Paper text:
The first enzyme in the pathway, peptide O-xylosyltransferase (XT, EC 2.4.2.26), catalyzes the transfer of xylose from uridine diphosphate (UDP)-α-D-xylose onto serine and thus determines the site(s) of GAG attachment on the core protein. XT1 and XT2 are type II transmembrane proteins consisting of a short amino-terminal region facing the cytosol, a single transmembrane helix, a stem region required for Golgi localization (Schön et al., 2006), a catalytic GT-A domain (Lairson et al., 2008, Müller et al., 2006), and a unique C-terminal domain of unknown function, termed “Xylo_C” in the Pfam database (Finn et al., 2008). XT1 has a two-lobed structure, with one lobe comprising the catalytic GT-A domain and the other comprising the Xylo_C domain. To better understand the initial step of GAG biosynthesis, we have determined crystal structures of human XT1 complexed with UDP-xylose and various PG-derived acceptor peptides.
Residue numbers in the entry:
A (entry chain B): 205 to 213
B (entry chain A): 253 to 310, 317 to 727, 734 to 959
Write the structure that this text describes.
Amino acid sequence: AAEGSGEQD
Amino acid sequence: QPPKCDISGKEAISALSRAKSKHCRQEIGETYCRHKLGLLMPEKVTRFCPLEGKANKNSVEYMPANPVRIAFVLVVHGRASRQLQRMFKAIYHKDHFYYIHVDKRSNYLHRQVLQVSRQYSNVRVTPWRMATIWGGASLLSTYLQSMRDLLEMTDWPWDFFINLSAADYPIRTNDQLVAFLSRYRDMNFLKSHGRDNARFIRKQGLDRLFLECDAHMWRLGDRRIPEGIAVDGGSDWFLLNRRFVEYVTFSTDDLVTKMKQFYSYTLLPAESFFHTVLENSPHCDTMVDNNLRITNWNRKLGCKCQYKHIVDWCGCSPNDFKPQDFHRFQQTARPTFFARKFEAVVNQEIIGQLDYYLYGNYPAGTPGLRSYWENVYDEPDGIHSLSDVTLTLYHSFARLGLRRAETSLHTDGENSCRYYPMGHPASVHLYFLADRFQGFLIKHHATNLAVSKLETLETWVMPKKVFKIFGRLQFSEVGTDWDAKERLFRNFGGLLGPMDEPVGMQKWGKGPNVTVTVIWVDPVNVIAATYDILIESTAEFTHYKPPLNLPLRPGVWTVKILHHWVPVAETKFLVAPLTFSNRQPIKPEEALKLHNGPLRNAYMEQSFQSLNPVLSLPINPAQVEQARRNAASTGTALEGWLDSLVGGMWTAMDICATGPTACPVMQTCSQTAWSSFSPDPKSELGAVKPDGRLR
Ligand code: NA
């Protein structure tokens, strides 16, 4: 599973 | 006062426009102008790693001779003290260390944590407390300050640093964890994003300047990625050994210095700061691309840009595990020792399965194993931390309980179960049984009028079932604070006042596409809104918030669902009239303007009077008049109107006494099965056992 909690704008 | 430089950036102007405090306005301008002149952010950084790229250096049934001692840093917030106590019981060992940081805004939880730190010598709490908002830069400040404190505690010789929230749980025993880390005590465990790196920088906003102030992350403009280093990132849940924590804390080399400055103005800094420092430091050859966690990512449900009011950015959150996910805790592909997220108010069954599978069943006869209690108001925090809605209704529940006490005793003489309410509620709990909401538990004081003595009591109130019905519809509900990720209302009881904006939710089963009609009806049969909705062939939940002019007419509202005029199902919800204004008894001029329906005679510009005869919903001119008379009432008249509505939608299931009582049919709370005073051994923390464990 991918990591990172940020989505743009 | 004016700024030190001309401010023309669209983003910065937007932040200055939205910032409330003078202090925050100046800090925005100062940061912007410092960055304008180019002496806020570093542009080049030295790399100390001899490797041209990355490392990724890739059984636990043995007994180590020199077992590692772990420092657990728990960063917690919220109300779930009992679930936190349960997890703390599962990970506790007398040879480890536990340093607990409680969000500045979670005072109830902090009081409970202080009782733990006093019982055990290897448990301490941080004296400093920050408001750690999602994505806020204060989270890295929290971790870095805790590392400095932990390194100075001479009496705590720890070898690893592990961070955990109140939503984590171990998926392997402490013995296996110690055996694994003892074998790899020179490694650092960090998980990277595992996708394209350029896109990772853009989605995270690393090329954007953020500033934390007034519990908000303001976006101020663009910035360059520093040159000469490799930027990486991923999960902000890791395990770091003492050697590397020492380097981050005390090193003054070019890399650590310029990264601490860079990441002071960074969104989600803990998700890339430690990755980036390790990769470009002398310790780069120690990284393992695995954080020993399972994170229940479900981005089709968890990426809804749900923090737009806290940060100037969008974000995602992991989901909560359900019982069907238990098999995922048994994989042997890679080593894993913790998982997130778990939430007892969402699903406790999976927590029970995991805990009994690791440490065995509790003995037969143990009470409370399928129950959950969560405190949602504690007296030391003050009635001003409640709203006028919750305060109004918690008072009503207490009176509903006292009325049950009086009517439960049958005698012709004096009634020794007659009470008079005193003061405000002492505490309120949510009560769940086998993952099914049971209602509220209200602790309150009252005078027993027969003996003229004060007593303390707890009342259990439960909401009456209202959803009435081969279609696809499974359930319908009205509430507020809809959680799109977990598909539930976080306002569990459905407590609503005249100024609330209700939301209609529907739950569907598999089946072909259909279209349905929704009807909102106010307490005097006035139709408030009507709309159709396509129920996709794959849809599982639908919801919508109609735009209704306020105030809402108080009373029992009705929501109806039809299919081409064929009735399907219906539900009801209570808009309660308020007895308090600013925590003070409401005055006639206030009750009048609040309880007499919306300003404009109707709720929307469009009218639906043509549908009253079709739906057999006539408007009795007597109710309208009585509703007008009810709108001007105060004091007793208003208290009788409210308690009438509450009694029609809520049931006082039982009431107990916490101490001595004169009512001969009242149970002692500690002897019941539902009271928050009844035994709950699964979350109780006792003496340390000979094996060093609590569980
Ligand atoms: Na202590």
